[PDB]
Design a protein around this ligand. Sequence first.
Ligand code: HEM
Ligand code: HEM
Lengths: 199, 199
Amino acid sequence: MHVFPRYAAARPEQAAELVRSNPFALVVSAVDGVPVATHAPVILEGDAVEGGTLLGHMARANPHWRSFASSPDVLVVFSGPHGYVSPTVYATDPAAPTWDYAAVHATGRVELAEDALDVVERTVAALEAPRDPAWTPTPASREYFRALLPGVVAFRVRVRTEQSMFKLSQDLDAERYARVREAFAADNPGLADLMDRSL
Amino acid sequence: MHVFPRYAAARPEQAAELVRSNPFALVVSAVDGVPVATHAPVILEGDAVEGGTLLGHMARANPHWRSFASSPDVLVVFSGPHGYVSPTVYATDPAAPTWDYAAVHATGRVELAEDALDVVERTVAALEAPRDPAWTPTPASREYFRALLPGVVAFRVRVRTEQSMFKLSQDLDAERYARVREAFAADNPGLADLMDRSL
Ligand code: HEM
Ligand code: HEM
């Protein structure tokens, strides 16, 4: 990821906001010299991505985690709303398409987490608490969780560096920008809500 | 990515289908020993992901491509529909949440593509052709494209290995599965359309 100045985060709290709202992340490591990636839920501990702690889990049957033992640097990609921008929307005669999106990339040293129960319980609360209705583990779910523990591996990442991208057509003139926003308001309201949060 | 047997592709053409329908991919390489990822449009050449050719582009100002010169192995992640599965939907007393999703991971040797114009023109056709209405570069767009060439770097990947995941609650019993599907039909019809394509 290269962040063009025009597409940088406007306020530094928008990164944590994206990360909290889009926990189904991509966890990436360099198994040998080749990237390997797992789709896993990853939550944030603290106010800032930068310098905070990420917590996640994956299947013990997924051999990816066996590569975390040496504590290599890992990259975690959080992806927010995204949408293709067609020149059909622009209605100008010379144009070129693009893709609008928001993402946060966090890099740091990974570590296997011994308290897998904490991790998965915190992840539940993270996903269920904003929902309506929210789900709270009944006491038998808590015992069920314990029975699932042998099959899960939890990990943590101390974020060394963080990069945020908010590529939301801000480089567009007034008229073309309005067209882009109103099409996403119809088609993709999460993306349109972010182009308001960018003004 | 580890693909649990129960979540494997049912027909081997579902991978190419996902890749064609979700071209906004994540291109991942091991800059030094650390993963670096760029969100870029990537299209498929041929009938099969496995053994086919991926084509993509990114900004010349994005230094990521400078790492492709040695032709390292790269990983390209295509992400289809996905959705959180809350135990609230299950309405059973012991349960644990999960995330349903479809993805294709393709690994191979990357190469800088000298015909960037072909690549970007093929990508336009890929994105616009299924749309309604489709956009066809006017002749002045084709000249505009040429003026943009200095700012773009195109690349290609010959797919050495491919992995597909269709994690779509197939391990669910009859009753719980129905509840999961009808909630996504309301909330997430792309995901629900895939759980039909899995039966
Ligand atoms: C809070 C929301 C949760 C979500 C979104 C979620 C999601 C997931 C996902 C996507 C995987 C696959 C990882 C991979 O491919 O390696 C997985 C694996 C697993 N998780 Fe979670 N999980 C949640 C909570 C929990 C809880 C509370 C437990 C309790 C211990 C748990 C235990 C497990 C187990 C045992 C597996 C492996 C299953 C298998 O072998 O197929 N998860 N989970
Ligand atoms: C077909 C649909 C297309 C999509 C979805 C698309 C999308 C994108 C994206 C997401 C980037 C950012 C890459 C990065 O972060 O490094 C980019 C960069 C770029 N692409 Fe495309 N593109 C398309 C077609 C084209 C065409 C036809 C051209 C003509 C040459 C072109 C030229 C460029 C240029 C010049 C840049 C760099 C812009 C900058 O420096 O900010 N693209 N494109």
